[PDB]
Amino acid sequence: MIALSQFNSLSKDEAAGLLAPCVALPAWGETLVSLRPFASRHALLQTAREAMANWGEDELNAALSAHPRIGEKPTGSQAHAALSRQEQSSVDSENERLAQALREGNARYEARFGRVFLIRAKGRSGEEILQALTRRLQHTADEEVAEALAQLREITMLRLEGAIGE
């Protein structure tokens, strides 16, 4: 973490770079960077929530362009890969039935909705994710866009909360 006071004093480029791993949407980070200095972490998080209130399918699809699939733990020391592994840490990779069900489930979801299946993985077992995946496969296009965006907002906030301190 970096302290709020430290975040408030950073250059526009360094502050943007710090926020970039939270979500793959430049307009979101740029809005937050330009509203410094923030009165509190409370204020930062509230502003962050408001900045994602108008996200639609266009933002969804753009954000998921390189999002790692559940059951496909990415390699690398970078923030993008490390956060994903950390978030997927409750998925049991050694369960062959589960791993195969996730691969088949991901393939079915992408064929149906045209994007990577997105879930807030933190604290969820592979079974919980698979059940959510199975449930969401029955959604209409518009229902799924809504839940996917809801999950994206959760992930983004958790990452921001992990990035900036009080």
CA dist 70 → 48, 105, 111, 128 (Å): 26, 10, 16, 12
Interatomic CA distance for residues 97 and 28, integer angstroms: 39
Asked if 140 contacts 106 with a C-beta cutoff of 8 angstroms, the reply is: no
Asked if 106 contacts 116 with a C-beta cutoff of 8 angstroms, the reply is: yes
CA dist 57 → 3, 62, 70, 124, 149 (Å): 33, 8, 20, 25, 8
Asked if 45 contacts 160 with a C-beta cutoff of 8 angstroms, the reply is: yes
Give the DSSP letter string of 93-116: TT-HHHHHHHHHHHHHHHHHHSS-
Give the DSSP letter string of 29-81: HHHHHTTPSPS-HHHHHHHHHHHTTT--HHHHHHHTTTPPPTT-PPPSSSHHH
Experimental method: X-ray
∠ CA 56-58-64, nearest 5°, is: 105
User: In sequence order, what are the residues at sequence separation of 6 or more whose Cβ sits closer than 8 angstroms to the Cβ of residue 11?
Assistant: none
Q: Can you name the CATH fold of 1-166?
A: UraD-like (1.10.3330)
User: In sequence order, what are the residues at sequence separation of 6 or more whose Cβ sits closer than 8 angstroms to the Cβ of residue 164?
Assistant: 1, 2, 3, 4, 7, 18, 41, 44
Interatomic CA distance for residues 149 and 48, integer angstroms: 15
Region of 41 please: left (phi>0), alpha (psi -120 to 50) or beta. alpha
Interatomic CA distance for residues 54 and 165, integer angstroms: 26
Residue type, 137: L
Measured in degrees and rounded to the nearest 5, phi and psi for residue 164 equal -120, 130
Asked if 18 contacts 159 with a C-beta cutoff of 8 angstroms, the reply is: no
Interatomic CA distance for residues 28 and 32, integer angstroms: 7
Does the N-terminal peptide bond of residue 37 adopt cis geometry, omega within 30 degrees of 0? Answer: yes
